[PDB]
Design a protein around this nucleic acid. Structure first.
Ligand code: ADP
Length: 258
DNA sequence: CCAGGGCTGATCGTGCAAAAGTCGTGCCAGCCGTCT
């Protein structure tokens, strides 16, 4: 509900439309898909969805679907009421349940193994997750929001990703425009990144931007995303020096031998 | 003078499992009873 303090810096007149779209999704409990490319700041949008929802007071755990162990999947997702030691007074909590009352964020959906895919598909459709041991089903209420950069229709075509959980979890998608599509906010991000760098390196003052530098970073196909642009500025501002002259040289990729 | 943070000690806990041991039941050898 309360707008958390985050950097979205939106002026592209397309990012504003995406922001309105996600704001419309803020109250609803329906599953949400975030579609983007490398970088693109999808995590900020996901945090925006969770943190402007009715259940925002709830927790906001975010699991890395690539990071879950294969064998330990069941206990990791559910937990075991039995303690680690004899006569234990408590148990470890699984990924699920630890999310109840709030949203669960999923990332790298495409690279999730088939074991994760099939185990996660069963739990969402019905809930009633049961920890290993005992016969007591616990009912859960968790919002799911996920972000990915690969092409899950192609993943379905190859069959390396099950289409059923996709269909269940594809109520609505939000499209994120690439930085090259935005092509208007580059000045403001460049400047904000440079100002942050000024304090990080403890440089005294920002020198300024030359027209040649503006032309070169503007006239770029930008396969890299906002973070690639961020790193670019980071490299050039440091290589420039102590701001006695305006910033003049931009190195697009630090790989050319020279 | 009252409230927040740190820190130290007080408190909780009689089961798991691996290996030795024991169980029942069979196989075979050696001595004894008896008829031919
Ligand atoms: N609007 C924005 N404001 C501030 N930073 C941004 C913005 N968009 C992108 N970024 C930067 O780009 C990065 C994208 O990270 P992330 O969303 O994790 O990429 P991916 O979704 O591919 O994993 C973030 O670390 C963030 O610092």
């Amino acid at each position: 509900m309360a707008e958390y303090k985050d950097n979205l810096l939106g002026e592209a007149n397309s990012f504003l439309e995406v922001l309105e779209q996600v704001s419309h999704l803020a109250p609803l409990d329906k599953p949400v898909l975030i579609i983007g490319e490398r970088g693109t700041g999808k995590e900020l949008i996901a945090s925006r969805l969770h943190y402007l929802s009715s259940r925002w007071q709830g927790p906001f755990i975010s699991l890395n679907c690539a990071a879950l162990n294969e064998n330990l999947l069941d206990s990791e997702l559910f937990g075991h009421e039995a303690g680690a030691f004899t006569g234990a007074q408590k148990r470890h909590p699984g990924r699920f349940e630890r999310a109840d009352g709030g949203t669960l964020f999923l990332d790298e959906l495409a690279t999730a193994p088939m074991m994760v895919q099939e185990k996660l598909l069963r739990v969402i459709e019905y809930g009633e997750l049961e920890r290993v041991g005992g016969s007591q089903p616990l009912q859960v209420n968790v919002r799911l929001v996920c972000a990915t950069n690969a092409d899950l229709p192609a993943m379905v075509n190859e069959g390396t990703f099950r289409a059923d959980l996709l269909d269940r979890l594809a109520f609505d998608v939000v499209q994120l425009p690439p930085l090259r599509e935005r092509e208007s906010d580059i000045m403001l991000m460049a400047e904000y990144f440079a100002i942050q760098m000024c304090r990080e390196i403890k440089l005294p003052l920002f020198p300024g931007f030359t027209e040649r530098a503006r032309e070169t970073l503007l006239n770029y196909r930008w396969p890299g995303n906002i973070r690639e642009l961020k790193n670019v500025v980071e490299r050039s501002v440091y290589r420039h020096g102590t701001s006695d002259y305006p910033l003049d040289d931009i190195i697009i990729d630090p790989f050319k031998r020279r």
